[PDB]
């Protein structure tokens with residue numbers, strides 16, 4: 001296949017890259033371009049470099065994992081499609097949001113025949129690729145992008161708990177404290193996390209008309225103004241009639257944690273139906289809170305990561321942005 005040709009082409013290169021143990025005993029992460037990768041994800045990056053073609057009308061969802069990706073896939077899909085479906089007919093009621101917004105470095109690489117990637121109408125894509133490594137076609141298209149980030153303490157806990165749920169990996173996971181130590185040293189997939197955020201922040205600073213820079217915690221506290229802003233930014237702003245008819249509030253409720261978690265499609269061990277999964281859909285909806293780290297980390301571990309944040313973000317403007 002075309003992806004198998006990519007894998008062969010970069011085999012020798014990827015073998016020359018530095019390698020490290022991950023959070024599972026047998027897991028090997030590879031370093032490239034300041035960031036750590038699973039092998040297949042780095043193959044997926046090069047495949048996208050060589051083959052992904054962005055259009056100016058595309059809209060790209062960007063995040064580091066466990067900062068709000070599922071939520072933004074739902075929101076962007078609902079914003080785009082709200083006039084295509086009667087409320088009860090919305091496909092989000094029936095299928096996990098990841099089925100509707102394909103990943104550049106995963107779905108486009110590993111699963112290029114899924115229906116949404118064959119749909120010439122679809123404008124929505126997502127990625128965890130660091131900003132400095134995005135394919136030139138994406139950079140050159142001028143397509144707009146949204147980036148979301150989250151408190152590193154909550155982001156870490158979201159990841160460590162999620163990884164207990166991966167198929168055929170029971171017991172294969174480092175302790176909380178050892179996992180936290182490698183997260184803080186920047187050893188995580190797509191990490192270092194703080195470098196990931198800073199990369200998009202600097203892009204936002206340089207191109208503030210092209211990137212909407214969002215924070216999980218402020219959206220969670222007060223989602224309606226942010227959803228309206230996102231829809232506007234996307235080019236699908238809510239009209240005055242729509243606001244009269246509560247349509248923006250309907251989108252917020254449909255994409256809320258409380259709705260999606262309780263859908264039949266996202267419960268139990270049910271998996272997505274478009275392509276193979278190593279997670280049940282239910283693994284994407286855990287607690288949805290701000291501050292759950294308080295139940296796992298000591299003041300000493302909090303001070304460590306909070307000190308890393310102050311040092312990484314010093315003099316950048318990031319923590320001031322509202």
Ligand SMILES: Nc1ncnc2c1ncn2[C@@H]1O[C@H](COP(=O)(O)O)[C@@H](OP(=O)(O)O)[C@H]1O
Pocket residue numbers: 063064065066067068069070071074154157158159161255256257258260284285286287288289292
């Ligand atoms: N619709 C939604 N609104 C808000 N948070 C959501 C959400 N759907 C999922 N989440 C939360 O977002 C995190 C997953 O991030 P991602 O989608 O990037 O993998 C999890 O956080 P918690 O593990 O803290 O519950 C998950 O519960």
